[PDB]
Design a protein around this ligand. Structure first.
Ligand SMILES: O=C1N=C(S)S[C@@H]1Cc1ccc(C(F)(F)F)cc1
Length: 101
């Protein structure tokens, strides 16, 4: 598949270990259980990591796929298990919604 570079649109995004101190990011998935909703979201950067300081992701980015795993819309229990081991770069797929405020 193709890949861009940087733009404020729904796409593949990739986040290198620029300063090696882990990624330092924050995500939340949902499921089709207790509420009807499903999905994944970048809740924040963690204000202290390599993918935080040089990836500078936005609060609210609706995540869909994960490094080594093209999920296209499935919950973190089969994806954050891969992302945590990354050691060098997360590829991701996201869609800009919400803001900091
Ligand atoms: O903050 C973190 N950096 C890591 S390395 S593991 C931990 C949890 C975490 C993993 C991946 C993501 C990401 F890449 F944003 F999906 C968020 C949080």
């Amino acid at each position: 598949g193709p890949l861009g570079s940087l733009r404020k649109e729904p796409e593949i995004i990739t986040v290198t270990l620029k300063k090696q101190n882990g990624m330092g990011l924050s995500i939340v998935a949902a499921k089709g259980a207790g509420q009807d909703k499903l999905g994944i979201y970048v809740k924040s950067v963690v204000k202290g990591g390599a993918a935080d300081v040089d990836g500078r992701l936005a609060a609210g980015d609706q995540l869909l796929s994960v490094d080594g795993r093209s999920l296209v819309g499935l919950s973190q229990e089969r994806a954050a298990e891969l992302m945590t081991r990354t050691s060098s770069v997360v590829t991701l797929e996201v869609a800009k919604q919400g803001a900091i405020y």
